[PDB]
Amino acid sequence: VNSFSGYLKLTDNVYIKNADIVEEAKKVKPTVVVNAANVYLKHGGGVAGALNKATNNAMQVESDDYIATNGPLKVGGSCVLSGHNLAKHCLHVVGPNVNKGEDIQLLKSAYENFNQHEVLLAPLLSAGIFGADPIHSLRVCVDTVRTNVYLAVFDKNLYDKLVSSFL
Numbered sequence: 408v409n410s411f412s413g414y415l416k417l418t419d420n421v422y423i424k425n426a427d428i429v430e431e432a433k434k435v436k437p438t439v440v441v442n443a444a445n446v447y448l449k450h451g452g453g454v455a456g457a458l459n460k461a462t463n464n465a466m467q468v469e470s471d472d473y474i475a476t477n478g479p480l481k482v483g484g485s486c487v488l489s490g491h492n493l494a495k496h497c498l499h500v501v502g503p504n505v506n507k508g509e510d511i512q513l514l515k516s517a518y519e520n521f522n523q524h525e526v527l528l529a530p531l532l533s534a535g536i537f538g539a540d541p542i543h544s545l546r547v548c549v550d551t552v553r554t555n556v557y558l559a560v561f562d563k564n565l566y567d568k569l570v571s572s573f574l
């Protein structure tokens with residue numbers, strides 16, 4: 408039993424809800440919130456900009472130190488950093504950005520990072536401003552993640568389309 412509320416159950420392990428991931432994280436304070444990161448951990452817009460704003464820029468400050476020490480992430484890769492006031496940990500995961508010409512096949516690799524964590528609050532990787540098809544991102548999530556994932560879909564109209572089209 409966990410404290411996630413109001414989710415539709417898609418499979419044994421994947422749940423979905425129309426919600427603002429920032430507000431969800433503040434309410435649940437999950438062990439792991441997933442950020443839709445880029446390789447530079449520059450949290451400007453989309454989920455990343457919103458999460459970082461909610462931390463009063465502490466996420467960005469921590470991220471800049473991480474990059475100065477370790478260099479950029481790989482597309483498809485991840486790192487674990489603090490969750491600040493939102494969660495215990497933030498798993499920064501880099502899905503491919505179609506608006507940069509990155510290989511959509513890397514989306515499966517990106518979702519594989521979720522399997523290192525028993526329970527996660529997450530967005531659909533490569534969706535939104537990353538330019539991939541969200542219906543595809545959900546399919547890859549369901550077919551790749553084996554741990555318990557609670558998906559927050561900000562757009563109510565998109566959420567209804569994802570539910571009604573889910574196979």
Ligand SMILES: OC[C@H](Cc1cncs1)Nc1ncnc2[nH]ccc12
Pocket residue numbers: 426427428429443453454455457530531532533534535536559560561562565
């Ligand atoms: O796939 C990630 C989606 C993509 C979008 C598609 N249409 C509108 S945003 N983004 C978000 N998802 C959940 N919470 C969020 N908070 C802030 C952004 C955000």
Ligand SMILES: [Cl-]
Pocket residue numbers: 452453454534535536537
């Ligand atoms: Cl987005």
